[PDB]
Amino acid sequence: HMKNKIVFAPIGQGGGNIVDTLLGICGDYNALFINTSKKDLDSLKHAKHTYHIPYAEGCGKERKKAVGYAQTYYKQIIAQIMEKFSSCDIVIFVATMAGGTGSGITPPILGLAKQMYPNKHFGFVGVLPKATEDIDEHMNAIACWNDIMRSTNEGKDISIYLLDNNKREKESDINKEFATLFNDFMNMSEGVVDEDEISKLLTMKKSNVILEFDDKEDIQVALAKSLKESIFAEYTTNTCEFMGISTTRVVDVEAIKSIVGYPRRTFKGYNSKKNIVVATGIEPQKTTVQMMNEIIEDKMKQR
Ligand SMILES: Nc1nc2c(ncn2[C@@H]2O[C@H](COP(=O)(O)OP(=O)(O)O)[C@@H](O)[C@H]2O)c(=O)[nH]1
Ligand code: NA
């Protein structure tokens, strides 16, 4: 259905882990696993389709060697995706940003795919490193972000799911939680948020965030705890474009808007299992990303 409309393009070990985790939850998705490391690809649990960059191996967080291996295979990689999954409207790229092949190869491949196939929708799921990681790791994530900004009109051309490894102790938890959040998002159509409404949310440009909250505490309090604990990178703006809401019981939607952010269009529905809010079209969290430059400059001066 909506899930078969989506094809993931995980690039690198971390991005491969996330999509693999998601497929473990639900195999209704499509994915082409891209990596310089044949080892990582062979070690995947649920990869039916993989693409090993020829004559390549793991790049040990060196993004310019990743490009070295990949640059000549960019088009065929895109050929693989678009012609094997020709009936997929939405191509979501998934990559960690501090790595070598995820960080260095995703922005050229994404940017090129945009130009070759203009009428498909493109998403980017990126993962910000922990603050304790070193200069190179942060320099890689800055370079990754900037390459995508420069290739997508500052995030305006694509959907952005921005994740923060600082928000959890284990990277695996980030993997599990996002995989859960995205699939719950996709299952909102089970008064219901319809598929076209889910489609609108999913394909909305700029930065998207998915939130779930409990029905114990007050809803303003309950959403506040979700925002604070969100695996997504923090946003400082107070508006968004489209908002999806699917809850177990009747809720004050305006309270949700005051806490999560004010949308110009809302889709509301009900489900029997989760209380989920999706904010889409949030301005790309450049402020949160800018902090990496602060880490770089503070770690640099330590030397
Ligand atoms: N959330 C999450 N982050 C990861 C994972 N693996 C790696 N990372 C992050 O990405 C960086 C290493 O990227 P990795 O994907 O292993 O390198 P790549 O294969 O060259 O893209 C580390 O600094 C981590 O911050 C993962 O499985 N989950
Ligand atoms: Na499912």
UniProtKB/Swiss-Prot annotation:
Coiled coil: none annotated. Changing E197A: Reduced GTPase activity, lower critical concentration value, filaments are much more stable. More 2-stranded filaments are seen than with wild-type. It is found in: Host cytoplasm. A tubulin-like, filament forming GTPase; the motor component of the type III partition system presumably used to ensure correct segregation of this bacteriophage. In the presence of Mg(2+) and GTP (or GTP-gamma-S) assembles into filaments which upon polymerization are almost exclusively bound to GDP. Filament formation is cooperative, requiring a critical concentration. Formation occurs very quickly and is followed by disassembly as GTP is consumed. Unlike its plasmid homolog in B.thuringiensis (AC Q8KNP3) GTP-gamma-S does not alter filament formation. This is Tubulin-like protein TubZ. GO terms for biological process: microtubule-based process; plasmid partitioning. It catalyses: GTP + H2O = GDP + phosphate + H(+). The gene is tubZ. Belongs to the FtsZ family. TubZ subfamily. One of its GO terms (molecular function) is GTPase activity. GDP binds at Q13, G14, G15, G16, N17, T96, G100, T101, G102, E133, N165, E171, N175. Its EC number is 3.6.5.-. Monomer. In the presence of Mg(2+) and GTP assembles into 2-stranded filaments which coalesce into bundles. Binds a centromere-like site (tubC)-TubR complex. The TubZ-TubR-tubC complex bind to TubY which reshapes the filament bundles into rings. A later paper by the same group shows 4-stranded filament formation and suggests the 2-stranded form is a short-lived intermediate. Consists of two domains: a nucleotide-binding N-terminus that hydrolyzes GTP and a C-terminus domain necessary for polymerization. The domains are bridged by a long, central helix. The C-terminus is thought to insert into the most distant monomer of the plus end of the filament, forming the complete active site and modulating filament assembly. One of its GO terms (cellular component) is host cell cytoplasm. SUPFAM superfamilies: Tubulin nucleotide-binding domain-like. Keywords: GTP-binding, Host cytoplasm, Hydrolase, Nucleotide-binding, Plasmid partition. Pfam families: Tubulin, TubZ_C_3. It is an enzyme of class 3 (hydrolase). GTP binds at N183. InterPro entries: Tubulin/FtsZ_GTPase_sf, Tubulin_CS, Tubulin_FtsZ_GTPase, TubZ_C_clostridia.
